[PDB]
């Protein structure tokens, strides 16, 4: 039901050559590309109705307000939050998670309290917790991984104890592609009297999110990964928790009364939005959501499942290539070529027009767990095709041959 | 030397009607409009070279990096910072000031330390200090104002003492239009062993900034007020201070090594940029800077001086209108009509196509100092004209007559 030609026709950026070869963008896990609907939403904003929001005193101001808060509602429906009061716009997943670490963790952790993460976590979902525990004298714990880089519910029950206040975990790992059992972990967390914090940066673009079904306490996501503008993300949190959290930042827009020494805050969600907000970016994110909903997240999810399966099979056709993670996975493949460093791989691939990523992918502890220094990584999205994966595996074959040849040439 | 027709031809948003009247946008102090150069910079980014930055492994990634860091350098030259290491991209002035309050104030304030602000400060430049002093048991002090809403160097010498660690003040007030004597206040602050924090949200769009000449320790500004995209601003800080400040946020991009419990940070400026940054917005801000530099800040400044003088004179031609602030001023006029509430004024003006602001303008303490509940406010920028000010004063005359008539009609 999903036509890939029709979808690709909407991404101007795809139709270009690099190094005399057709662009083959396989770096969506770093950042996604944007369709016209999104870019033109930005355009129409700046061309026709930019103004500050929340004053409703003049025509453009009212239009801007309607667009901004309208986008809040689009986000709310998109992740099935109960209320707009639980939808905060932030700069991105990183900032969202830091807000939870700052306003929730730092205020609710005493020595002997535990916060539990996992070895596969992006840095966004590591360092805020390191800092909160250091600030509070609490202690940081890591759920171990199984051999295929998935997580066992048994290990979860093992690690989270009656002293655990916070469990923070990825919905989908940008590295292993594992989909973690978020719903079961929420139940487990709650049984021990903890909240669960979900890093949803890699799930949100690619699959339906239902915060009511996941029963997550907090869920963070980033516009740039889902066809949206850069610079914008969301923090969702249960109304009851956000009511008792103090703001992470202070200034205009988030106050009610300001005296000389003391101030009171707006109601949610504005309590958490200091300063002129990300007006254009939030409206474009709303457009991104409209776009993805019109294709259907289930459809996108099916597409990525299909591409991931095809990729794993074609990679298994190559000698001297190791793929990391489980079989059951999101649309990305992290890998190494035997004897060639991933930076080199990525460089050569760019010479064929192929965009991939090489490095620690913001997961240094996970790299160490994998017993590697660095990895190459390819990621797929709703505009990618099997032909592109063919080009990738052919280029990896050619790269293997080339490096072997260089080796033998040395006399 | 500056042609206003030619400049207005570049702002699509201006050429439209509201309520059957030509738009007359006089709300630039809330947010400024954008020229094609900026909007098309965004367009070209998303159309041609969007990718994550700082990896330089594939063509688009390198272009994106060059555009982002290129824009950092444009900012650096634009405010004459010595180094890019002193230029941090943030979400906006609010966030910039909160970063200083979080990472500098909160870490360097002991009971009996003073932080000194003024009565005219925007909320962005009040509440972070309230919170830092409450967190540290330090004490908050306010420099008094003179009768015309300016600041006396004598009052400054009075208020800042040998116990003062931080002096935080507006360069230009969004309400009074006063230009504060920043350079002299820096000298004064430093004599008592304090740093000075400059809120440059209202100066930056409108006049040359020279941080070396101002000798400010920190200076905050916002893209949206200067023809730039929403969602982006800058914090400048002296390299020596930023080296000793801990990050305000933590995650990928701002680390060097991440172990299980402990992490080390990147060098400046990246130490302060957690997460995928505001890629498109920062590049558009660079474009905004290019635009303003091609017109010339001195030229823009002259234009606003001219419009402000013309406005004050025409306002003084109206009976029953009170204008707030000094004669020597930036391009904005805050005012009330005798007996009509400013909200009403602004509503009626919108019915004539005229966009102004009515409320506390994020300066509740200053409103109380003025002995008013709220104000109406009009602001000018590089696209505004004398004809527009004529339309405004005519509409204020008509409004006065209308409300008086309504009064007499009641029998």
Curated annotation (Swiss-Prot), chains A, B:
Cofactors, names only: pyridoxal 5'-phosphate
Catalytic reaction annotation: (sulfur carrier)-H + L-cysteine = (sulfur carrier)-SH + L-alanine
Cross-referenced SUPFAM superfamilies: PLP-dependent transferases
Regulation: A Cys to Ala mutation in SufU (Cys-41-Ala) has been described to be a competivie inhibitor of SufS activity and a non-competitive inhibitor.
CDD domains, alphabetized: SufS_like (cd06453)
Active site (catalytic residues): 362
EC numbers, comma separated: 2.8.1.7
An example Gene Ontology molecular-function term: pyridoxal phosphate binding
Keywords associated with the record: Pyridoxal phosphate, Transferase
Key word Ribosomal protein present: no
Positions where N6-(pyridoxal phosphate)lysine occurs in the chain: 225
Source organism, top-level taxon: Bacteria
A Pfam family: Aminotran_5
Top-level EC class as recorded in UniProt: transferase
Lipid metabolism listed as a keyword: no
GO BP terms: cysteine metabolic process
Family membership: Belongs to the class-V pyridoxal-phosphate-dependent aminotransferase family. Csd subfamily.
Reported function: Type II cysteine desulfurase that acts as the initial step in the SUF-like Fe-S cluster assembly pathway. Catalyzes the removal of elemental sulfur atoms from L-cysteine by using the cofactor pyridoxal 5'-phosphate (PLP), resulting in the production of L-alanine and persulfide. Activity is stimulated by SufU, which acts as a sulfurtransferase that receives sulfur from SufS via a zinc-ligand swapping mechanism and transfers it to SufB.
NCBIfam families per record: sufS
Name of the protein in question: Cysteine desulfurase SufS
Organism: Bacillus subtilis (strain 168)
Lineage of the species this protein comes from: Bacteria, Bacillati, Bacillota, Bacilli, Bacillales
């Amino acid at each position: 039901h999903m036509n890939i030609t029709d979808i690709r026709e909407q991404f101007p950026i795809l139709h270009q050559q690099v190094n005399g070869h057709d662009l083959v963008y396989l770096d969506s896990a770093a950042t996604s590309q944007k369709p016209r609907a999104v870019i033109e939403t930005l355009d129409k904003y700046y061309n026709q109705y930019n103004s500050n929001v929340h004053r409703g005193v003049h025509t453009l101001g009212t239009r801007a307000t309607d667009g901004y808060e309208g986008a809040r509602e689009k986000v709310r429906k998109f992740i099935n939050a109960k209320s707009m009061a639980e939808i905060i716009f932030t700069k991105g997943t990183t900032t969202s998670l830091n807000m939870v670490a700052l306003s929730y963790a730092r205020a609710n952790l005493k020595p002997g309290d535990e916060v539990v993460i996992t070895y596969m976590e992006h840095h966004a979902n590591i360092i805020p917790w390191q800092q909160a525990v250091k600030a509070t004298g609490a202690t940081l714990k890591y759920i171990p991984l199984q051999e295929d880089g998935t997580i066992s519910l048994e290990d979860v029950r093992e690690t989270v104890t009656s002293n655990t206040k916070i469990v923070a975990v990825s919905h989908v790992s940008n590295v292993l592609g594992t989909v973690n059992p978020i719903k079961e972990m929420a139940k487990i967390a709650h049984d021990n009297g903890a909240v669960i914090v979900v890093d949803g940066a890699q799930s949100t673009p690619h699959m339906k999110i239902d915060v009511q079904d996941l029963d997550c306490d907090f869920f963070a996501l980033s516009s740039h990964k889902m066809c949206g503008p850069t610079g914008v993300g969301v923090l969702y949190g249960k109304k009851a928790l956000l009511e008792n959290m103090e703001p992470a930042e202070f200034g205009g827009e988030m106050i009610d009364f300001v005296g000389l020494y003391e101030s009171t805050w707006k109601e949610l969600p504005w309590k958490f939005e200091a300063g002129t907000p990300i007006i254009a970016g939030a409206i474009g994110l709303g457009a991104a959501i409209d776009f993805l909903e019109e294709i259907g997240l289930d459809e996108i999810s099916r597409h990525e499942h299909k591409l991931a399966a095809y990729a794993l099979e074609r990679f298994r056709q190559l000698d001297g290539v190791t793929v990391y993670g489980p079989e059951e996975r999101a649309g990305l493949v992290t890998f190494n070529l035997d004897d060639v460093h991933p930076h080199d791989v990525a460089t050569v691939l760019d010479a064929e027009g192929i965009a991939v990523r090489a490095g620690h992918h913001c997961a240094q502890p996970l790299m160490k767990w994998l017993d590697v220094t660095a990895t190459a990584a390819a990621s797929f999205y709703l505009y990618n095709t099997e032909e592109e994966i063919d080009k990738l595996v052919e280029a990896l074959q050619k790269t293997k041959e080339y490096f072997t040849n260089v080796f033998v040439d040395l006399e």
